[PDB]
Amino acid sequence: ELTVQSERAFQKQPHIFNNPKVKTSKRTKRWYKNAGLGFKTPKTAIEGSYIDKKCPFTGLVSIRGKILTGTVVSTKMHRTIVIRRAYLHYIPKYNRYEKRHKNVPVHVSPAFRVQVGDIVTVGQCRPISKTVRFNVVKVSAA
Amino acid sequence: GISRDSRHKRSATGAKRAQFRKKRKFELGRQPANTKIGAKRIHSVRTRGGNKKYRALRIETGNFSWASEGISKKTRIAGVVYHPSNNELVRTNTLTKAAIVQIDATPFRQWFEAHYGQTLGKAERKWAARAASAKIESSVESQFSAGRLYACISSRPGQSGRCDGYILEGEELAFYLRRLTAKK
Amino acid sequence: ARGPKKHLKRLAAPHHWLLDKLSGCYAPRPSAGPHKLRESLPLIVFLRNRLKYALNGREVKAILMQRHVKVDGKVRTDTTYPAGFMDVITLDATNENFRLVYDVKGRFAVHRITDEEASYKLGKVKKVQLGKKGVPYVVTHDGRTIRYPDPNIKVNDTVKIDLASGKITDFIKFDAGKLVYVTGGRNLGRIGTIVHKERHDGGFDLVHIKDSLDNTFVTRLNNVFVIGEQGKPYISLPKGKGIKLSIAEERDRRRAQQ
Amino acid sequence: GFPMKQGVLLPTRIKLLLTKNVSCYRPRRDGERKRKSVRGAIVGPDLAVLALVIVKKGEQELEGLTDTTVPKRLGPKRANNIRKFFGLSKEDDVRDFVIRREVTKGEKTYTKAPKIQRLVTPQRLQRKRHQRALKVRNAQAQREAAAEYAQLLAKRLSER
RNA sequence: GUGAACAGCCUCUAGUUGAUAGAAUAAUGUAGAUAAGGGAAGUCGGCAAAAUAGAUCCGUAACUUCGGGAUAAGGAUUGGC
RNA sequence: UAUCUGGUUGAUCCUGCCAGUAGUCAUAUGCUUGUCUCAAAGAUUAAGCCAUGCAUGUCUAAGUAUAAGCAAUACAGUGAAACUGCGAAUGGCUCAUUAAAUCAGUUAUCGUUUAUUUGAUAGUUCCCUACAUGGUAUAACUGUGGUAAUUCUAGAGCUAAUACAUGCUUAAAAUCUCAGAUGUAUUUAUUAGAUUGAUGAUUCAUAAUAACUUUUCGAAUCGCAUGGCCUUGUGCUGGCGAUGGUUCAUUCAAAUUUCUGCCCUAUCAACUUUCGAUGGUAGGAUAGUGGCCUACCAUGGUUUCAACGGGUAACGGGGAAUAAGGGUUCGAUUCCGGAGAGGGAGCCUGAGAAACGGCUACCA
RNA sequence: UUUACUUUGAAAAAAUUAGAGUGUUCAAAGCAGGCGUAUUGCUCGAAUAUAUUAGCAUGGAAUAAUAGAAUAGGACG
RNA sequence: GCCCGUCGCUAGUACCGAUUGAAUGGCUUAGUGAGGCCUCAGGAUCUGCGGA
Ligand SMILES: [Mg+2]
Ligand SMILES: [Mg+2]
Ligand SMILES: [Mg+2]
Ligand SMILES: [Mg+2]
Ligand SMILES: [Mg+2]
Ligand SMILES: [Mg+2]
Ligand SMILES: [Mg+2]
Ligand SMILES: [Mg+2]
Ligand SMILES: [Mg+2]
Ligand SMILES: [Mg+2]
Ligand SMILES: [Mg+2]
Ligand SMILES: [Mg+2]
Ligand SMILES: [Mg+2]
Ligand SMILES: [Mg+2]
Ligand SMILES: [Mg+2]
Ligand SMILES: [Mg+2]
Ligand SMILES: [Mg+2]
Ligand SMILES: [Mg+2]
Ligand SMILES: [Mg+2]
Ligand SMILES: [Mg+2]
Ligand SMILES: [Mg+2]
Ligand SMILES: [Mg+2]
Ligand SMILES: [Mg+2]
Ligand SMILES: [Mg+2]
Ligand SMILES: [Mg+2]
Ligand SMILES: [Mg+2]
Ligand SMILES: [Mg+2]
């Protein structure tokens, strides 16, 4: 992510040591995990340089709750998106529905690229900000 | 006291939340340790569940690991040179996780000489075996000539009462040297 | 609210206990113990409401404090001790043992058993883990931890517990075609054979059960207790064997006695 | 009637939040602290009664201060305490003589001696032996259980 | 030079050092000041005096002819290096 | 349990309300009131104010007994007092606050704490006591008192512990370092945990390495029966328990948490953001996640699919009344959840309280 | 591809509601109780349905919506 | 026949209204700020260069 060491601290995966004694090939040992539930670890996460400790693949978070789908309505934050989850609410008395929605702020790994539209799949993780409880797990750029 | 609750800290829509449930003990915060250097003073904090935390005030020595030889020698902290979160912590020499400190480097000097013995910066044939692995980074060995090794604090002195850490190496070391040359 | 509750209001007690509504304001709150609050049967209830040995809680305590009652081979003088599923309650006076199993209706039935099988009890493997110093252990449904389990024992299996040494004597594997008790849900108290196990990663696993009368019902993996193979239960089954007669055939059975 | 506080260093009385292990306050509950008024350490005309301890004796005695003598109400209870009081040795069988109070109550004068604590006793030695033997026995049982489990593992790995 | 400044204050060029003097330091004056606590009780009346004041930032009501009111009111800051 | 009737007119048919009619565990009130069963009951207004009395104490065989208390060769029974332990955070009451808050159903903890219960679990400690250490200790009690008064306490003299503070013994086998080190607990770093256990998934369980600790644990505890061997000695072993103890698991829990669902109001259309609003990095703080807080950074976040603001004579729900169907209204109140103890705030103890029949302060 | 929708299943504490049985003397209720005896006691029960919002699993693919290959940057091998 | 409004009588109900009206509560700006808690210290006197 654009000279990844672009913050005031050194950005690195914790407990992942690049031993300078050993003359290995990559010299930049990168940790990653299979998030589970049939979500493929992207090749961008596999071979990236970003750190993003909140990534479902190269980070310290886990996907263990509800799996939601939504439409990206905002990408204006850094590593965070807001997805719109439209649904119809039933009113029994009128036997009819009314359109409702709930914005869900979702953390997006740099492994993914998202824009407005771009129906995404998000998995519940632990709270990673005041409002964010979900992480992008499939981009599905529909 | 300090609350970590979210009943204050108004909702994401910007609405001011009404009060209910006056501050609860299970959501309390406490004041920062603000660990200083020298003349060790560790205070015990009785935490939730009957457990105990250790506020380290004025810590002098800590255990620092090289992680290239796996030694983790105990050394004395010279001072703080860089802090990614607050320059005032550097100015006041506050010991804190991720703080870049200087360690005495003398225990590491002794261990390197007693283990490999190859005049790092100025039972007989064990060095004959472990001589090929005696080369170390120029940017690490150059620090011994001044007797100050750059290190990063990895423990939380306000939580555990210890000031353990690791010696900076490789890309992390180079990054922190570049920041030091830019800010000094 | 400020700490754990110590009381259990009546109408808040588990319905399986069949407690009288207008007896008092409270029900015996099961103490902390092996099985659960909702899934247990307090010794006071088992001694006063199911067997009628004691007339009240005072007489229940009088029974328990003279070391008659024994749960899983231990004296257990605690009045609200949470005896639960497949526990062995032996009374040395009126010398007899009971196995706490669910009747067809989901209540803890009084199930008289003989000593030769009251010697042991069955336990569903809640988890398999590596303990300290690298020692494997099995956690069973009744909160028992048993070290050095057979390396082929997995979760959802059943283990026969010696109940004198507390070791694994035999173990049954969770697999299609094995006899299962249902220990929760709508089908609580039903006995059948596993037909299929639906995985549902991240969700709850489901299991399809066919009773002897070919009735097929699906229930969560949490409340299926393997008790052996078809026709060969490792325990003595209660009077109904988990058949779940409909209300019509139940009425027919009742009126067949005229 | 307000008591004096040892280190206040005032000639007047002030209110202090008192704690468990201090004077002038007996806490009625664990962790309780009460704000009570205590008198300062310096003596003045405000004192109704001062308290003195004689720490050096001189000329002609006073009545009820040296003429009278109150005997200590209790002899030592612990074994080594009785030894240290009576100038005995460790191997002196402190049971043989102990302070014995005769209660002339029912024309029997059945002497009431204190129970002795920390006394080396065959029961204590038996308990110590039981503890040590249980410990070593449990260690041996764990070792043999681990041995037989390792045997099981090696046997089931030999299936190849 | 300071400073927004042909302000006030100090200085260079130029000019002047001319106003009757000397000595004392009472009252009462004229001109200039200060004052504990109170704060307009003084008085026809706050007369007189005091308080405020530059600049930067924040904030600014009724009313209004919509242009104002407005520097409203009310806060903060200011040196040197 | 799918029903109407009277009232506008001289008469008519309508619209339309008024009136009638029936129910209300729905209140009040009037008159009347013989029997049996059941039993709501200071919610509404004043979460207004309160005299008095009671509502939280607790001992077994098994922590500490020399009561100068009772009883028929250390104490041995009973046992006031006190120390210690545990509890007092449950219960009970009320509905004031509270409108995405609570609450309900549904989730998560691979994001944490958890006294207790239950199960498992500790041969490793020493740089002249272990056949057992100290007062660095004192209460009760004795005696001397102060105050008008409080469940106020001072000074003086004793005395214990499962209180407080210390402190050895368990070899054996066993691998590393150049004789020592290796239990567990803490902290950091590193390694394995494969394609040698588990998960949908992990830096998981767990192990290993090098170190680190204002020292964590590793019973100096108690009752009852006494046994076996025996150089029959202050011998060596040895039973059933009680209590305590590290870690793990379990249970009782707790705290946060996913999704969706609240009455009226636009005579509330923009709101939030300097003083955290939305997100990022680091840190601090927490039991732990998290703008929970701090520093730097980015300018975000919500909204006509009604945000934000305001009202509620709004605690939420399970439920209640009435109901052909669809609905309307009610739910302070027997159960569940929340919150509060005159209003706020702060905090001690404790596993657990921001406790109020706990303390501290201000206000009334 | 993505949905809505609809089926079915688990779920939605108890009490309350409908409702089975049961002579509280009847009844409201309650979950009791019943059987012949001179026992050293035998035995039936404390069912069943319901909350159709939201979530989970599941069958269907009508209806309604959504997306594909057009400057081929298309598909298959 | 019916009828409308002013004006008279009486009664009732809202509304406007000087008082820079008043009170209560929430939120908020600027000030003062108890108290406990953490912390820099401080050291009565109880102690064996140390400790409480
Ligand atoms: Mg709760
Ligand atoms: Mg200028
Ligand atoms: Mg003046
Ligand atoms: Mg003045
Ligand atoms: Mg004034
Ligand atoms: Mg005047
Ligand atoms: Mg005058
Ligand atoms: Mg005048
Ligand atoms: Mg003037
Ligand atoms: Mg101004
Ligand atoms: Mg004006
Ligand atoms: Mg009417
Ligand atoms: Mg009669
Ligand atoms: Mg009231
Ligand atoms: Mg309560
Ligand atoms: Mg781990
Ligand atoms: Mg953080
Ligand atoms: Mg309501
Ligand atoms: Mg209210
Ligand atoms: Mg209610
Ligand atoms: Mg009310
Ligand atoms: Mg309640
Ligand atoms: Mg409370
Ligand atoms: Mg009141
Ligand atoms: Mg309070
Ligand atoms: Mg009270
Ligand atoms: Mg209370």
Curated annotation (Swiss-Prot), chain A:
N-terminally acetylated by acetyltransferase NatA. GO terms for molecular function: rRNA binding; structural constituent of ribosome. Pfam families: Ribosomal_S17, Ribosomal_S17_N. One of its GO terms (biological process) is translation. There is a cross-link at residues 12, 43, 53-54, 76, 93, 102, 130, 138 (Glycyl lysine isopeptide (Lys-Gly) (interchain with G-Cter in ubiquitin)). Signal peptide: none annotated. GO terms for cellular component: 90S preribosome; cytosol; cytosolic small ribosomal subunit. NCBIfam families: PRK08572.1, uS17_arch. Component of the small ribosomal subunit (SSU). Mature yeast ribosomes consist of a small (40S) and a large (60S) subunit. The 40S small subunit contains 1 molecule of ribosomal RNA (18S rRNA) and 33 different proteins (encoded by 57 genes). The large 60S subunit contains 3 rRNA molecules (25S, 5.8S and 5S rRNA) and 46 different proteins (encoded by 81 genes). There are 2 genes for uS17 in yeast. Belongs to the universal ribosomal protein uS17 family. Component of the ribosome, a large ribonucleoprotein complex responsible for the synthesis of proteins in the cell. The small ribosomal subunit (SSU) binds messenger RNAs (mRNAs) and translates the encoded message by selecting cognate aminoacyl-transfer RNA (tRNA) molecules. The large subunit (LSU) contains the ribosomal catalytic site termed the peptidyl transferase center (PTC), which catalyzes the formation of peptide bonds, thereby polymerizing the amino acids delivered by tRNAs into a polypeptide chain. The gene is RPS11A.
UniProtKB/Swiss-Prot annotation, chain B:
Keywords: Cytoplasm, Phosphoprotein, Ribonucleoprotein, Ribosomal protein. It is found in: Cytoplasm. GO terms for biological process: maturation of SSU-rRNA from tricistronic rRNA transcript (SSU-rRNA, 5.8S rRNA, LSU-rRNA); translation. GO terms for molecular function: structural constituent of ribosome. It comes from the Eukaryota. Pfam families: Ribosomal_S8e. The modification Phosphoserine is found at residues 65, 68, 72, 85, 138-139, 142, 145. Residues 1-30 are annotated as: Disordered. One of its GO terms (cellular component) is cytosol. Its main location: cytoplasm. The modification Phosphothreonine is found at residues 61, 106. InterPro entries: Ribosomal_eS8, Ribosomal_eS8_CS, Ribosomal_protein_eS8_euk, Ribosomal_Se8/biogenesis_NSA2. Component of the ribosome, a large ribonucleoprotein complex responsible for the synthesis of proteins in the cell. The small ribosomal subunit (SSU) binds messenger RNAs (mRNAs) and translates the encoded message by selecting cognate aminoacyl-transfer RNA (tRNA) molecules. The large subunit (LSU) contains the ribosomal catalytic site termed the peptidyl transferase center (PTC), which catalyzes the formation of peptide bonds, thereby polymerizing the amino acids delivered by tRNAs into a polypeptide chain. Present with 14400 molecules/cell in log phase SD medium. Belongs to the eukaryotic ribosomal protein eS8 family. This is Small ribosomal subunit protein eS8B.
Swiss-Prot record, chain C:
InterPro entries: KOW (IPR005824), Rib_uL2_dom2 (IPR014722), Ribosomal_eS4 (IPR000876), Ribosomal_eS4_C (IPR032277), Ribosomal_eS4_central_region (IPR013845), Ribosomal_eS4_central_sf (IPR038237), Ribosomal_eS4_KOW (IPR041982), Ribosomal_eS4_N (IPR013843). It is found in: Cytoplasm. One of its GO terms (cellular component) is cytoplasm. One of its GO terms (molecular function) is structural constituent of ribosome. It comes from the Eukaryota. The modification Phosphothreonine is found at residue 114. PROSITE patterns: RIBOSOMAL_S4E, S4. GO terms for biological process: cytoplasmic translation; translation. The modification Phosphoserine is found at residues 31, 246. Disulfide bonds: none annotated. Residues 41-104 form the S4 RNA-binding domain. Pfam families: 40S_S4_C, KOW, Ribosomal_S4e, RS4NT, S4. There is a cross-link at residues 61, 133, 160, 167, 173, 178, 210, 232 (Glycyl lysine isopeptide (Lys-Gly) (interchain with G-Cter in ubiquitin)). Keywords: Cytoplasm, Isopeptide bond, Phosphoprotein, Ribonucleoprotein, Ribosomal protein, RNA-binding, rRNA-binding, Ubl conjugation. Component of the ribosome, a large ribonucleoprotein complex responsible for the synthesis of proteins in the cell. The small ribosomal subunit (SSU) binds messenger RNAs (mRNAs) and translates the encoded message by selecting cognate aminoacyl-transfer RNA (tRNA) molecules. The large subunit (LSU) contains the ribosomal catalytic site termed the peptidyl transferase center (PTC), which catalyzes the formation of peptide bonds, thereby polymerizing the amino acids delivered by tRNAs into a polypeptide chain. PANTHER family: 30S/40S RIBOSOMAL PROTEIN S4, SMALL RIBOSOMAL SUBUNIT PROTEIN ES4. Present with 573 molecules/cell in log phase SD medium. There are 2 genes for eS4 in yeast.
From Swiss-Prot, chain D:
There is a cross-link at residues 57, 72, 90, 155 (Glycyl lysine isopeptide (Lys-Gly) (interchain with G-Cter in ubiquitin)). One of its GO terms (molecular function) is structural constituent of ribosome. It is found in: Cytoplasm; Nucleus, Nucleolus. Keywords: Cytoplasm, Isopeptide bond, Nucleus, Phosphoprotein, Ribonucleoprotein, Ribosomal protein, Ribosome biogenesis, rRNA processing, Ubl conjugation. One of its GO terms (biological process) is maturation of SSU-rRNA from tricistronic rRNA transcript (SSU-rRNA, 5.8S rRNA, LSU-rRNA). GO terms for cellular component: 90S preribosome; cytosol; cytosolic small ribosomal subunit; nucleolus; nucleoplasm; small-subunit processome. Its main location: cytoplasm. The modification Phosphothreonine is found at residue 104. Component of the small ribosomal subunit (SSU). Mature yeast ribosomes consist of a small (40S) and a large (60S) subunit. The 40S small subunit contains 1 molecule of ribosomal RNA (18S rRNA) and 33 different proteins (encoded by 57 genes). The large 60S subunit contains 3 rRNA molecules (25S, 5.8S and 5S rRNA) and 46 different proteins (encoded by 81 genes). Interacts with snoRNA U3. uS11 interacts with MPP10. Component of the ribosomal small subunit (SSU) processome composed of at least 40 protein subunits and snoRNA U3. Belongs to the eukaryotic ribosomal protein eS6 family. Present with 66000 molecules/cell in log phase SD medium. There are 2 genes for eS6 in yeast. This is Small ribosomal subunit protein eS6A. It comes from Saccharomyces cerevisiae (strain ATCC 204508 / S288c) (Baker's yeast). The chain holds residues 60 to 219 of 236 of the full protein.
